[PDB]
């Protein structure tokens, strides 16, 4: 609490406030470009998956446990991004702990290993840096280690309900045995010779993975802007309190040094 | 009334169309007013949607699924949708020559991928 | 350990080690937040807050300023309550159930009345 | 305005200790990949 | 076609046809389009918390 | 030059460098090392100001350089402490602020009725660790009409010399400058101030917009063009042509590493091809309508190679 | 540049600019991480760590505290080793090969012995 | 949050056991013969397979077994004050066999 | 209110509340735009821009720097002009009609002469 210790703490807190303010301004520019990709993925999901709503496609009994896919990111500094995704998948795994988990990020794989390390069957790293595209969703669906041999296939992600907060939603994916066993599945002119049931079921997994990755990246970028604004605001309050302590210590150091020279010269 | 929306941008979006001669999985079919509900897949052809008069846009679609709803709604969901003027004739000949030499020359999925790419490149070059 | 015993010496070293780790990491929890910690640092921050409020007991002379009764915990009851909270037996309780209380008996009665 | 050229590592507190541990962890992981690739190229 | 005999379905056939049509068109119209055909995710099949070969590409 | 507080080797090295470049024939040297008494070093500021005041009272100009201001304050406090006197702040006497303000107020510009002379005072304030709000640093900055700050962090990056534009300012403004250099300095002041506040976005170049990319490219070329080497001063005609090419947009197409080679190539080609534009800017000291059109055509033809 | 030459002046200015730029980039990695660094910022952080350990040589009088033998580098060998590392000729080597070494000859022998 | 670095797992586990073994109690000084056997088992990796809570009990059990069985190795480290080739081979074999009860 | 009256206290509190809300909302308008607000926030942001320029009148000694004439508003004329702009009587006027002007009579003559 001297003059040298107060100067090092005030200079280090000022550099953290400038980095937090610059990161919040850069997050606002990236949110505008990510909003266009999220709007195109939401409109394409309502048209490509429109045949499943008119045919009433649903699952029934469990066949060899199930399959879970937790879509997230690999970096931090985004607030409660990794905590909300891990809490939603742990609540649904209580009634079926024998199902496999496929983590698509370093942040979701670290929290899931401390509670259910044996349930993790797949781990994907390097997807939270750049923006998602169709090449990243199509490569993870084809190498999911037999993804068509499960009755239920959930996709745990984070849905951005607003432009400030978010919530962890889930979307189910039907298999090849559940797409052809719908109620109004024979209403459309589908060819029985070629692959129509297995092709439409595998195409829904790659389409839902692209929509969950686009919505999860927009929710993580929006949550990172609120965390950067809160860190910059908290740094300003700490710099104001440190400036009042440094001003009182500077005046006390001048009075203590002048009293020592006046006492020695008067004796 | 068409809803040709891709996975990156929307072309038709709102219902403001009449005819849509898009290539499906079978042949070169064309949606009229209130067509039957045929939710068939789309192949790599030319998706020319005739808007009222002769204002058809030659959109070279790479394939997808032309979903037809029962309420006179045609949702031609494809992967890519580029115009005919966005493909140069010089670069189109180089891709067809490389795919023909690589076909029936290796194994695994190298010969299977080269055979499907040679058929889509020959149909787009003849419709220029 | 030669005056208070081996049981009281281990409880004093474990409670002081948890409070020192949370105080040194106060620069990251007040700036970045509590979500920037890992899995091991998150459990130590929650146990340090409940252990600091459990040691503050209401005195008998300060009954007019606090409003609660005076609690006088013994030496054997204070060592058994601190060892059970640091092992994971009181992690499901809230942080307000141990503030201004006695030993292990007063912490269990305050959590049941607040949840009703 | 104020000088802050390396004020995080010069303090020695919570931010100073975390900056040195993050740089040492990244350099230790990259040294293992460079040492394994150099031994395989010499034989 | 005959893509059902291999390990490619409707999702793999649509991605291969869209990437091949973009490279065969105009070379100057490849703005904001080459990033949709490459990735860097490594799929590591975990078992028991060890894993096997980290397959990518 | 009034060397006060320096050693014996520092005074001999500075006088030998000025004689080799023909600069010691009209420059007074006040030798005042620290090996003498406290009365000789404390009176070095008053003795040097009296000899330089003879030129300003006759019809000439003078320029005093009190190097340094921190060494003069230590010599005055040493003689007062031994004469049985009371001290004050930072072990100084009561007349600490009056000792530096009396010697700096004599270097002023006279009117036409007194002779028309002037005198400049260049006192160097040696700070401790960059703190400009100390005891002897705050007294010399409040009495002077401007201060040039020098940080130790910008000198190791590439700025020669390290002169902070956001901390150094002049109280005279553009009233004591040439009319030719004032036209290019007006637009450069607004571009340098906007690029300093947005300098934190340089680490994330993949998220720059249209307005952010134009300010970062123009701000980096303007700061590197003003960096000069030691003992390499430029005239008013050579500095007006280099500042006009960076403020208009003729230096944005060049790279950042080629900023050093473009300063010597543009100055050498302008002295052999367009010598009439450089000689007119120094004699008249301003720029009319004919000088602006000729300078823009010569810079555009030389930027294509 | 008039006392040590034009070649030695460029090596001293380039080493001081890389060491000063690493201090500003290190503050952003403690709050944001290594994801904010691009291709140029990643190569500058690795070159700054190897240049700081290469200048530290073992003295002859400090052999009882270090354990290794004393090395003495000349003036011509120190300027040639610093200019080659700043251009991109020793980018594939590790940071442990230059720590507690001599000139350019001792840095190449330490990298081959540590990989065996 | 980092849980990788397989090569750094041996150095991190050995550092925690070495700090607890060197911490002695009050009025409990050790000689040069008892401190040389405890520092060799923690620096060579022999104490990495033991637990962290059993670091206090392992110091008393190793010193008691070296005073009744292999008493010649403890007396040579205090009289000569060094360890040559014969003393290094006998100390490494006795520390490995004593780890399995 | 006990020194300037109840009329002057109400006009000073209303102008200070609108200027403080517009200054704190400057960080949210640059990241979310100007059209992403409510009905009450859009009307208060438009009136705050014209009120900041209406209080900056041109002095008589500063006529050679701005070019406008010197305006000397009294105490009764300044309180009547600020109360009419906060009630909605000058909501249809432009933002540039109040700059470099003083009093309620100067804002009506500058707004009608700017367009026609």
A–H: how many Cβ contacts below 8 A? 4
- DSSP codes joined into one string, C44-101: HHHHHHHHHHHS-PPPSTTHHHH-SPP----HHHHHHHHHHHTTTSSSSS-SSSSTT-
| Side-by-side strand order, sheet with B40-42 | B40-42, B64-69, B73-78
Query: Which residue in F171, F196, F258, F282 is the catalytic one?
Result: F171
**Tokens 């005042």 identify what position?**
F32
Taking CA atoms, what residue in F is nearest to A20? F200
**3-state DSSP call for residue E32?**
coil
G19 close to F (CB below 8 A): yes
Q: Collect all residues with Cβ–Cβ distance below 8 Å to B102 and sequence separation of at least 6.
A: B110, B111, B114
Q: Collect all residues with Cβ–Cβ distance below 8 Å to A25 and sequence separation of at least 6.
A: F201, I31
Taking CA atoms, what residue in H is nearest to C10? H53
Query: 3-state SS of chain H?
Result: CCCCCCCCHHHHHHHHHHHHHCCCCCCCCCCHHHHHHHHHHHHCCCCCCCCCCCHHHHHHHHHHHHHHCCHHHHHHHHHCCCCCHHHHHHHHHHHHHCCCC
62-81 in chain G: CB under 8 A from chain D:
none
Can you give the resolution of this entry in Å? 7.8
CA distance A191 to B43: 14
G26 close to F (CB below 8 A): no
Q: Which residue in F89, F200, F201 is closest to A258 by CB distance? A: F89
- Cβ contact A30–F207 (<8 Å): yes
Q: Collect all residues with Cβ–Cβ distance below 8 Å to F112 and sequence separation of at least 6.
A: none
- C-alpha distances in Å from residue F169, one per residue of A39, F123, F182: 51, 15, 15
For chain B, first and last CA: distance in Å? 27
CA distance C18 to C10: 13
- Nearest Cα of chain C lies from the Cα of H38 at a distance, in angstroms, of 24
Q: Collect all residues with Cβ–Cβ distance below 8 Å to G21 and sequence separation of at least 6.
A: F157, G44, G48
- CB burial of residue C3 (10 Å; 0-12, 13-18, 19+): exposed
- Cβ contact A121–E45 (<8 Å): yes
Question: For this structure, is F171 an active site residue?
Answer: yes
D2 close to G (CB below 8 A): no
Instruction: Give how far the C-alpha of residue G34 lies from the chain's centroid of Cα atoms, to the nearest Å.
Output: 21
Radius of gyration of chain D (CA): 17
Spatial contact of H78 and H31, defined as CB atoms under 8 Å apart: yes
- The one-character DSSP state at F200 is G
A77 close to G (CB below 8 A): yes
- Nearest Cα of chain D lies from the Cα of A254 at a distance, in angstroms, of 22
CA distance H40 to H92: 8
Spatial contact of G93 and G81, defined as CB atoms under 8 Å apart: no
- The one-character DSSP state at E36 is G
C38 contact residues in H (CB cutoff 8 A):
1
Q: What is the dihedral of CA F13, F18, F21, F26, to 10 degrees?
A: -160
C25 contact residues in D (CB cutoff 8 A):
14
For chains A and D, having 3+ Cβ pairs within 8 Å is answered yes
Radius of gyration of chain F (CA): 23
Q: Which of A60, I104, A45, A165 is nearest to B6 (CA)?
A: A45
- CB burial of residue F255 (10 Å; 0-12, 13-18, 19+): exposed
A8 contact residues in D (CB cutoff 8 A):
7, 10-12
Q: Which residue in A8, A9, A14 is closest to D2 by CB distance? A: A14
| Side-by-side strand order, sheet with A170-173 | A170-173, A153-156, A67-71, A100-104, A120-125, E42-47, E50-55
Taking CA atoms, what residue in F is nearest to G35? F204
For chains G and I, having 3+ Cβ pairs within 8 Å is answered no
- CB burial of residue A65 (10 Å; 0-12, 13-18, 19+): middle
CATH for D22 = 1.20.5.500
| Neighbouring chains to I with at least 3 Cβ pairs closer than 8 Å | A
Q: Which of B38, B25, B73, B60 is nearest to E10 (CA)?
A: B25
Q: Which residue in B7, B40, B41 is closest to A44 by CB distance? A: B7
Relative to beta strand B57-61, strand B81-83 is: antiparallel
E40 close to A (CB below 8 A): yes
- Nearest Cα of chain G lies from the Cα of F216 at a distance, in angstroms, of 17
Query: What sign for the dihedral angle of Cα G110, G116, H5, H7?
Result: negative
Interface test with A, best of H1, H2, H4 (most A CBs within 10 A): H1
| Neighbouring chains to F with at least 3 Cβ pairs closer than 8 Å | A, D, G
Assigned token pair, D26: 């990244």
Q: Collect all residues with Cβ–Cβ distance below 8 Å to F263 and sequence separation of at least 6.
A: F225, F242
Taking CA atoms, what residue in B is nearest to E6? B109
Instruction: Give how far the C-alpha of residue F221 lies from the chain's centroid of Cα atoms, to the nearest Å.
Output: 20
- Nearest Cα of chain D lies from the Cα of C25 at a distance, in angstroms, of 6
- Cβ contact B7–A188 (<8 Å): no
- Nearest Cα of chain A lies from the Cα of D42 at a distance, in angstroms, of 31
Spatial contact of G78 and G12, defined as CB atoms under 8 Å apart: no
CA distance C77 to A54: 67
- CB burial of residue I110 (10 Å; 0-12, 13-18, 19+): middle
Spatial contact of H101 and H93, defined as CB atoms under 8 Å apart: no
CA distance F237 to F228: 16
Count other Cβ atoms within 10 Å, centred on residue F105.
11
CA distance I27 to C11: 50
- Cβ contact A47–B3 (<8 Å): yes
| Neighbouring chains to B with at least 3 Cβ pairs closer than 8 Å | A, E
Question: Residue E44 is inside which H or E element, if any?
Answer: strand E42-47
- Cβ contact A163–I31 (<8 Å): no
Helices (H), chain A: 3-48, 50-55, 81-92, 106-112, 134-142, 176-179, 197-265
Q: Which of H64, H62, H91 is nearest to H76 (CA)?
A: H91
- Cβ contact E51–A125 (<8 Å): no
**3-state DSSP call for residue C109?**
helix
Domain that holds residue D37: 1-43
Phi and psi dihedrals of I58, rounded to 5?
Answer: -80, 130
Count other Cβ atoms within 10 Å, centred on residue A143.
15
B92 close to E (CB below 8 A): yes
Q: Which residue in E6, E16, E24 is closest to B95 by CB distance? A: E24
For chains B and A, having 3+ Cβ pairs within 8 Å is answered yes
Interface test with C, best of D11, D13, D14 (most C CBs within 10 A): D14
**Tokens 């998220």 identify what position?**
F207
Largest interatomic CA distance in chain F = 74
121-140 in chain F: CB under 8 A from chain D:
130
Assigned token pair, H1: 């949050």
Q: Collect all residues with Cβ–Cβ distance below 8 Å to D13 and sequence separation of at least 6.
A: A9, A12, C27
Give the total number of structural domains in chain D: 1
F–G: how many Cβ contacts below 8 A? 19
Q: What is the dihedral of CA F254, F258, F264, F266, to 10 degrees?
A: -10
Spatial contact of A156 and A69, defined as CB atoms under 8 Å apart: yes
- Nearest Cα of chain A lies from the Cα of F219 at a distance, in angstroms, of 18
Relative to beta strand B73-78, strand B81-83 is: unpaired
H29 close to C (CB below 8 A): no
Relative to beta strand F2-4, strand F30-32 is: parallel
**3-state DSSP call for residue E16?**
helix
- CB burial of residue C107 (10 Å; 0-12, 13-18, 19+): buried
Per the entry, the structure determination technique was: cryo-EM
- Cβ contact A122–E44 (<8 Å): yes
- Cβ contact A18–F200 (<8 Å): yes
- Nearest Cα of chain D lies from the Cα of G22 at a distance, in angstroms, of 9
Spatial contact of A107 and A157, defined as CB atoms under 8 Å apart: no
C38 close to H (CB below 8 A): yes
């Amino acid at each position: 609490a001297t003059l040298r210790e107060i100067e090092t703490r005030l200079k280090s807190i000022k550099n953290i406030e400038k980095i937090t303010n610059t990161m919040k301004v850069v997050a606002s520019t990236r949110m505008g470009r990510a909003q266009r990709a999220m709007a195109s993925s939401r409109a394409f999901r309502e048209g490509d998956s429109d045949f499943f709503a008119t045919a009433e496609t649903s699952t029934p009994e469990t066949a060899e446990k199930t399959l879970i896919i937790a879509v997230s990111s690999d970096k931090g500094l985004c607030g409660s991004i990794h905590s909300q995704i891990a809490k939603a998948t742990r609540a649904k795994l209580q009634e079926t702990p024998n199902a496999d988990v496929v983590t698509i990020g370093d942040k979701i794989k670290a929290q899931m290993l401390r509670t259910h390390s044996s349930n993790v069957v797949l781990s994907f790293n390097g997807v939270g840096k750049e923006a998602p595209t169709f090449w990243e969703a199509s490569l993870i669906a084809d190498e999911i280690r037999k993804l068509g041999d499960y009755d239920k296939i959930e996709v745990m992600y984070n849905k951005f309900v607003s432009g400030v907060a978010f919530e962890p939603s889930v979307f189910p994916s039907f298999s090849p045995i559940s797409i052809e066993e719908s109620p109004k599945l024979s209403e459309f002119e589908l060819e029985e010779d070629q692959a129509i049931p297995t092709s439409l079921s595998q195409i829904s997994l790659t389409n839902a993975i692209l929509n969950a990755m686009a919505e999860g990246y927009a929710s993580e970028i929006s949550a990172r802007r609120n965390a950067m604004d809160n860190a910059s605001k908290n740094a300003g309050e700490m710099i104001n309190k440190y400036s009042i302590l440094y001003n009182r210590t500077r005046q006390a150091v001048i009075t203590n040094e002048l009293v020592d020279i006046i006492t020695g010269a008067s004796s | 009334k068409v809803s040709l929306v891709a996975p990156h941008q929307a072309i038709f979006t709102n219902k403001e169309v009449s005819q849509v001669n898009l290539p499906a999985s079978s042949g070169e079919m064309g949606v009229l007013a209130n067509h039957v509900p045929t939710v068939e897949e789309l192949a790599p052809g030319v998706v020319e949607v005739i808007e009222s008069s002769g204002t058809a846009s030659k959109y070279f679609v790479s394939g997808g699924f032309a979903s037809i709803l029962p309420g006179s709604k045609l949702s031609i969901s494809t992967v890519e949708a580029h115009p005919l003027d966005a493909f140069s004739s010089e670069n189109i000949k180089s891709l067809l020559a490389e795919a023909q030499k690589n076909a029936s020359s290796a194994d695994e999925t190298v010969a299977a991928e080269a055979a499907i790419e040679i058929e889509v490149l020959e149909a787009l070059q003849a419709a220029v | 350990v030669s005056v208070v015993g081996q049981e009281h010496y281990d409880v004093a070293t474990g409670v002081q080690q948890t409070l020192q780790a949370y105080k040194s990491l106060q620069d990251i929890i007040a700036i970045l937040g509590m979500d920037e910690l890992s899995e091991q640092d998150k459990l130590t921050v929650e146990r340090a807050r409940k252990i600091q409020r459990f040691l503050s007991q209401p005195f008998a002379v300060a009954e007019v300023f606090t409003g609660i009764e005076g609690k006088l915990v013994r030496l054997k009851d204070t060592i058994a309550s601190f060892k059970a909270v640091l092992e994971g037996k009181y992690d499901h309780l809230p942080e307000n159930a141990f503030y201004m209380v006695g030993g292990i008996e007063d912490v269990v009665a305050k959590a049941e009345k607040i949840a009703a | 305005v104020r000088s802050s050229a390396g004020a995080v590592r010069d303090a020695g507190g919570a931010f100073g200790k975390r900056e040195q541990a993050e740089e040492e962890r990244y350099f230790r992981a990259r040294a293992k990949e460079q040492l394994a690739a150099l031994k395989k190229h010499h034989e | 076609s005959s893509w059902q005999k291999a390990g490619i379905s409707f999702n793999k056939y649509l991605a291969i046809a869209a990437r091949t049509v973009q490279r065969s068109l105009k070379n100057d119209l490849k703005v904001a389009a080459e990033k949709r055909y490459i990735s860097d995710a490594k799929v590591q099949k975990l078992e028991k918390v060890s894993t096997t070969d980290l397959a990518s590409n | 030059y009034v060397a006060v507080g320096q050693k014996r080797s520092t005074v001999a090295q500075l006088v030998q460098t000025l004689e080799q470049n023909d600069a010691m024939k009209y420059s007074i040297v006040v030798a005042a090392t620290a090996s003498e008494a406290a009365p000789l070093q404390y009176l070095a500021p008053f003795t040097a100001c009296a000899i330089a005041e003879w030129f300003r009272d006759n019809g000439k100009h003078a320029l005093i350089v009190y190097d340094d201001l921190s060494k003069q304050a230590v010599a005055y406090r040493q003689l007062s402490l031994l004469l049985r006197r009371p001290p004050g702040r930072e072990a100084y006497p009561g007349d600490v602020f009056y000792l530096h303000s009396r010697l700096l107020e004599r270097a002023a510009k006279m009117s036409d009725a007194n002779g028309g002379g002037s005198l400049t005072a260049l006192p160097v304030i040696e700070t401790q660790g960059g703190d400009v709000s100390a005891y002897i640093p705050t007294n010399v900055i409040s009495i002077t009409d401007g201060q040039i700050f020098l940080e130790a962090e910008l000198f190791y990056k590439g700025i020669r010399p390290a002169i902070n534009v956001g901390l150094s300012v002049s109280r005279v403004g553009s009233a004591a400058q040439v009319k030719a250099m004032k036209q290019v300095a007006g637009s450069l002041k607004l571009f340098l101030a906007q690029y300093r506040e947005v300098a934190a976005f340089a680490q994330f170049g993949s998220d720059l917009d249209a307005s952010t990319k134009q300010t970062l490219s123009r701000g980096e070329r303007l700061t590197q063009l003003l960096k000069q080497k030691q003992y390499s001063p430029q005239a008013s005609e050579e500095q007006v042509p280099v500042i006009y090419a960076g403020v208009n947009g003729f230096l944005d197409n060049i790279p950042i590493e080629r900023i050093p080679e473009f300063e010597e190539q543009f100055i050498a080609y302008l002295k052999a091809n367009e010598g009439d534009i450089l000689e007119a800017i120094r004699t008249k000291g301003e720029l009319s309508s004919e000088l602006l059109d000729k300078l823009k055509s010569a810079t555009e033809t030389f930027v294509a190679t």
